[PDB]
Amino acid sequence: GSMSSVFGAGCTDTCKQTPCGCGSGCNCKEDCRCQSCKYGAGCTDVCKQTPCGCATSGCNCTDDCKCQSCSTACKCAAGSCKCGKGCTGPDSCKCDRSCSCK
Ligand SMILES: [Cd+2]
Ligand SMILES: [Cd+2]
Ligand SMILES: [Cd+2]
Ligand SMILES: [Cd+2]
Ligand SMILES: [Cd+2]
Ligand SMILES: [Cd+2]
Ligand SMILES: [Cd+2]
Ligand SMILES: [Cd+2]
Ligand SMILES: [Cd+2]
């Protein structure tokens, strides 16, 4: 009965939905290539763009994202740290939304 070794293509029915139901719980394998459940944290493919297009087309995530492309700029300057996190501006602000400067 087990002619196919379940390890990669052992996906679930929920993975063949439209929209895919795995957005609310994956029951497939880590060998899946479905864009619907191929996200991490919860980002659009727009956020995976280069350059990122969240602040160009539509930002889905929050300032919690380590992506300095769609996050809010910090108030620090070249050599002047404000929040005290250790950044000197948006360029070096790889922090979360915990910055009071946001
Ligand atoms: Cd899927
Ligand atoms: Cd899935
Ligand atoms: Cd799958
Ligand atoms: Cd993101
Ligand atoms: Cd982004
Ligand atoms: Cd974004
Ligand atoms: Cd700051
Ligand atoms: Cd700072
Ligand atoms: Cd920061």
In a domain, 75, yes or no: yes
Structure tokens at 46: 């727009």
Instruction: Give the distance (Å) from ligand 5 centre to CA of residue 16.
Output: 27
Which listed ligand is nearest to 22 at the C-alpha?
Answer: 2
Same domain, 33 and 47: no
Nearest to 72 by CA among 82, 85, 59: 59
Nearest to 97 by CA among 59, 55, 54, 64: 64
Spatial distance between the Cα atoms of 58 and 35, rounded to a whole number of angstroms = 18
In a domain, 76, yes or no: yes
Instruction: Quote the domain boundaries for residue 18.
Output: 8-38
In a domain, 56, yes or no: yes
Give residues with Cβ within 8 angstroms of 73, minimum separation 6: 89, 90, 93
Same domain, 63 and 26: no
Structure tokens at 12: 């679930």
Same domain, 87 and 48: yes
Same domain, 34 and 52: no
In a domain, 98, yes or no: no
Same domain, 34 and 50: no
Instruction: Give the distance (Å) from ligand 5 centre to CA of residue 36.
Output: 18
Instruction: Give the distance (Å) from ligand 5 centre to CA of residue 54.
Output: 6
Cβ count near 72 (within 10 Å): 15
Q: Which residues sit with Cβ closer than 5 angstroms to ligand 1, an ion?
A: 15, 20, 22, 34, 36-37
Instruction: Give the distance (Å) from ligand 9 centre to CA of residue 2.
Output: 53
Instruction: Give the distance (Å) from ligand 2 centre to CA of residue 54.
Output: 24
Nearest to 97 by CA among 67, 57, 76: 67
